[PDB]
TrEMBL record:
Keywords: Hydrolase, Protein phosphatase. The active site is at C11 (nucleophile), R17, D117 (proton donor). Residues 5-142 form the Phosphotyrosine protein phosphatase I domain. The lineage of its organism: Eukaryota, Metamonada, Parabasalia, Tritrichomonadida, Tritrichomonadidae. Belongs to the low molecular weight phosphotyrosine protein phosphatase family. This is Protein tyrosine phosphatase. It comes from Tritrichomonas foetus (Trichomonas foetus). The keyword Signal does not apply. PANTHER family: LOW MOLECULAR WEIGHT PHOSPHOTYROSINE PROTEIN PHOSPHATASE (PTHR11717:SF7), LOW MOLECULAR WEIGHT PROTEIN TYROSINE PHOSPHATASE (PTHR11717). GO terms for molecular function: protein tyrosine phosphatase activity. The keyword Transferase does not apply. SUPFAM superfamilies: Phosphotyrosine protein phosphatases I (SSF52788). It holds the Pfam family LMWPc.
Length: 146
């Protein structure tokens, strides 16, 4: 009974480590679900040069397309099956709004140290993907897939 779900990969705008989950996963399995980038802070949108992250991604192993970060509504809970929050702020906030009856779960992704691409040096493209996948085998495989 192996099925596919959908984890909400969020971080802080759907740009840092967010647009990397779709590629890391797309290549990890080939083409399924469990990949849902999101963000609870419509601050950095319609901007942010994601050519560096997307570049290293295709140079390390990541197939994406566009990262139009957008505000997260309330369907994120009934629009998928799992919610992955990179930084703790995402898990803490998203939990401060979650209702009291739903069918989705909220899990944290790596500690507040791995995925931390700031926005000045290329010290995230490598680390971001590193954790993006280094935490996708011990997670997706144990989140209800493989």
């Amino acid at each position: 009974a192996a099925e596919k779900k959908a984890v909400l990969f969020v971080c802080l705008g759907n740009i840092c480590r967010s647009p990397a989950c779709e590629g890391i996963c797309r290549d990890m399995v080939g083409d399924k679900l469990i990949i849902d980038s999101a963000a609870t802070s419509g601050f950095h949108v319609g901007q942010s040069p994601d050519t560096r992250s997307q570049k290293v991604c295709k140079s390390n192993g990541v197939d994406i397309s566009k990262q139009r970060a957008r505000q997260i509504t309330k369907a994120d809970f009934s629009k998928f099956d799992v919610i992955a929050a990179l930084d703790q702020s995402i898990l803490s906030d998203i939990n401060s709004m979650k209702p009291s009856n739903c069918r989705a779960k909220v899990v944290l992704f790596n500690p507040p140290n791995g995925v931390d691409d700031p926005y000045y040096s290329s010290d995230g493209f490598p680390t971001m993907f590193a954790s993006i996948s280094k935490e996708m085998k011990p997670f997706l495989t144990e989140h209800g897939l493989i």
